[PDB]
Amino acid sequence: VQKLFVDKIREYRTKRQTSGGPVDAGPEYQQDLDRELFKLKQMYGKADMNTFPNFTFEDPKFEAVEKPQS
Amino acid sequence: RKLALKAIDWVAFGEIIPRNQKAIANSLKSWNETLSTRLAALPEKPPAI
Amino acid sequence: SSILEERILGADTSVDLEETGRVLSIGDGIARVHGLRNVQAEEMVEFSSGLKGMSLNLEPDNVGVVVFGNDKLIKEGDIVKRTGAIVDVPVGEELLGRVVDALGNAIDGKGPIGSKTRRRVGLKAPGIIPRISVREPMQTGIKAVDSLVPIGRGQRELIIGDRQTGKTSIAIDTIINQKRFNDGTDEKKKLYCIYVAIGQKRSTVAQLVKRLTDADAMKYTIVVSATASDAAPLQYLAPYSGCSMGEYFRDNGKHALIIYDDLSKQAVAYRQMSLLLRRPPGREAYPGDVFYLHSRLLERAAKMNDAFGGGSLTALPVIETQAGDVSAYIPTNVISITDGQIFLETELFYKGIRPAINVGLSVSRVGSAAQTRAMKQVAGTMKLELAQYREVAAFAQFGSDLDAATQQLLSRGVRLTELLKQGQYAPMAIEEQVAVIYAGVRGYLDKLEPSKITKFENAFLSHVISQHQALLGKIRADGKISEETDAKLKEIVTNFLAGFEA
Amino acid sequence: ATGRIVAVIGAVVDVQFDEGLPPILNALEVQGRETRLVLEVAQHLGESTVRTIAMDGTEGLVRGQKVLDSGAPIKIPVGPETLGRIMNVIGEPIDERGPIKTKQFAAIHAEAPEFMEMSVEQEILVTGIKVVDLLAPYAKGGKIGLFGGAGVGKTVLIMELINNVAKAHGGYSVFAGVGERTREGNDLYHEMIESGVINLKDATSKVALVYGQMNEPPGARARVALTGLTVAEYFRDQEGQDVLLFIDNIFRFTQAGSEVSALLGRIPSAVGYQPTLATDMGTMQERITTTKKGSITSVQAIYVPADDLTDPAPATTFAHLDATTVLSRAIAELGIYPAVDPLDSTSRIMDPNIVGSEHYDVARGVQKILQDYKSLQDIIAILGMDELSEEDKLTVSRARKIQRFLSQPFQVAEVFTGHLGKLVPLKETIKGFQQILAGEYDHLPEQAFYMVGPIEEAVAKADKLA
Ligand SMILES: Nc1ncnc2c1ncn2[C@@H]1O[C@H](COP(=O)(O)OP(=O)(O)OP(=O)(O)O)[C@@H](O)[C@H]1O
Ligand SMILES: Nc1ncnc2c1ncn2[C@@H]1O[C@H](COP(=O)(O)OP(=O)(O)O)[C@@H](O)[C@H]1O
Ligand SMILES: [Mg+2]
């Protein structure tokens, strides 16, 4: 069916004329890609784009031992 | 690999014999065991970027 | 995108005359097909919508066919085609590190598996000439298994017990523990593994691939998966397909291992599939040849001679039993195919012995006693010292006092019982096993308390891997524990016992 | 697209078409009745003839009576307006408050999720029951079963996990009744209206309801469980919430599937069940999942026939769970309520890295003392207590203080006995069992550990009797 071989490539080239993502999204693709974009961040964490690690650690304080001896 | 060795000091080190200060050494070796291998996995270097 | 367009130019639209049989009925998976003259038995037939099926019964009027999939796209009056091949699955090393369904299509989504050779699921076990006896060991890393109930390479060993006792965990510490040989250097100490999931929900098999990928265990296994949602002819075909990827290894040189989890769910997929083909029921409505179902499977687990390649194929079938009764129909038919067993119980699991192995009953035809040379020294005496314990240590009510006579021997058991307990997903090595077992049988623990031996073990084990690495390398290399190697260990246990509790 | 009735056996109506055979599991509409009668195609018996299973009663049908083809399976109206409404197997309002007006419709029959849409993340859902928090902790997103006979407590236990979890929940909720009695399905409407969960006047209601009870024909009980399972998937995949799901009872999906399997022409398997017992169960249970798009926290009550756990209908449900709460009869003859078997109940999150290594050692250490009381019941029953040692009169007296300290007064059971329902937190049970294992309360009697909440009531009940 090479007449069908040409007819699924030629209506693939029409999909390669794109402006803003989906062609017939409407309220469908706008809600779904925003529902999924939250879920990759919801149970994952709150993370910005480029912020480095900012913290500070304190070690164990070295106490002394009192000892009258001999 | 910044890491220090030591001597074999487990036998009489709990026998420090303070004024009934048995807990002073019996807690001392207890900190000594966990801190040894845990700081060994710190001391050498960080992995590849 | 360039990927969709290149997939559509590589597609071949070949057309030919088929051989074709009109459908007469479709209900509950069985499609009695009018027509189909030259069909074989066990041939794979292909419905119109993309489904696939296998023609089991031949008959003069109709042809019974069972479906690999779902029977709702199939309407009376459809078209059944002929492939021309008895049912075959792809095979190779290229399936390594994947999760696949029961016909070799990937359900992980890493893509198409590039496989080159195809092998039937109904091939024949090799006979009497091309085998040899069992020379090698297979290390599990469990300490109650490796010392007391050893398992050779090429020996069918049955893990049997109830639900939620340890049957899956026992066979997953075994998958993890071969990590140390697979990154080594010799090609004859490796062990490539295979797990077959029959009748399991996908929220257990997608969770076991997680446990097998943090420890990087998944780079040397395959997971053939037929979940509980699948068609009943897909849970029947799964162990015959998983066993046929095992025999790429064994028939080319290497050593394989295969776990059937479990084989009480490959039987109720044969009872249902062959009641709707109108075959008369036997006992418990099982068919006549459930013994022939399991026996033609568990005899491919060979150990070939060295003029064929010398490869091996171990097998570890799991069996779930009801209420711990071992005299049922499907248990006893598979006890008497396997060389040895591992009897997992419940009162061992709850009293505290975990892994809950009945070491009294866990018999094993020892596999030409390929335990290893050093473990023979310390677990030879352990086997007898534990057997001496079990005859005499079941009173729980004492009236008389014989500390010179009896209470010395039963103090050697509780030090060796509480030594045998283990954790989970952290399996040991064999020379780390010889060291910890040395300290138990040589009297070097009778002055402890039994509530401190599990604490004594990890402090001991961390001391020997850190400070004594060149010691343990002479046990693994030389095999045996030599007399000068007996000398060096005599101080280390006593030097550590001098400063253990302080 | 028309056809006539040919044969009628109970609830298996045969119907012959002339052209346009319906595909399997369509719906057929019987013309000439006062109510709606929908037939769902099951088989294809050869030469333009199907065999169907009917959703309502078949009395009054004659041969030749016309039958019309819908074109689609049983569809129900699904959406956010389904909350506070009661439905039946074909999705019609049986609350007499008028129609359900949604924008979309959902078929009853859909497939299962794939492999690569599973979520593995496990947590702990603290409930407030001591037997479940300590020994067998529930998860947040996993299936739970409550096995039990007849008269043990599988629904007083399910009325607690609503009273403790569905109040403090933030998302929605779905209840389903499959084959259990109808006055209990009326006291869930007049207890969720009074307590603000059903709002009759605006759109601030949380729970949905779906009902097919023990008066229906067995083509309805076999398909009512796939109905509440569909209203609890729109609230997962298309709205993205965290939904509960309570099913009672799920055995009648199977009991009423071996009543229409004899008449379809099938040889029976073991003790009387259908040949396909464990493929239709693995197609209903494989859709009740937590996935990457939402999370369903199932709680299913399961019945065991004639008090037998090796019967084929309960004993094939076990591979589909995460937690398990096997109840018992002989426990409940003593008075221990909730009569949970501490030795038969499991989890997959009881683990020292998940439940915390302090909790995991009070867990395994209290099973060890419980097994050792069971392993001497041969000798105590024949011989006596008085022929024991002194160490094993101290796993007997300590494991009778532990059995009694697993019975808790529930909130829903105040109306029975007149005792205040107690909720304990998690951290006050671990602390309260370490003081029975270490041996601090070995002077208090055993009548003081019984039917109390946190551990300070046990010393207070011991303070009363003197
Ligand atoms: N070595 C061990 N020590 C202590 N507990 C363990 C060990 N191995 C497994 N367990 C625990 O025992 C429980 C059951 O183990 P597992 O799931 O392997 O049993 P199973 O019989 O395979 O279950 P199923 O009956 O569902 O197949 C799990 O909760 C697991 O965490
Ligand atoms: N927590 C409890 N406390 C006291 N009595 C209970 C408790 N749970 C159940 N019961 C008793 O057991 C019976 C259980 O019946 P019910 O739970 O309604 O249905 P099922 O027969 O399915 O268990 C109740 O009528 C009640 O008398
Ligand atoms: Mg298992």
Ligand SMILES: [Mg+2]
């Ligand atoms: Mg009930």
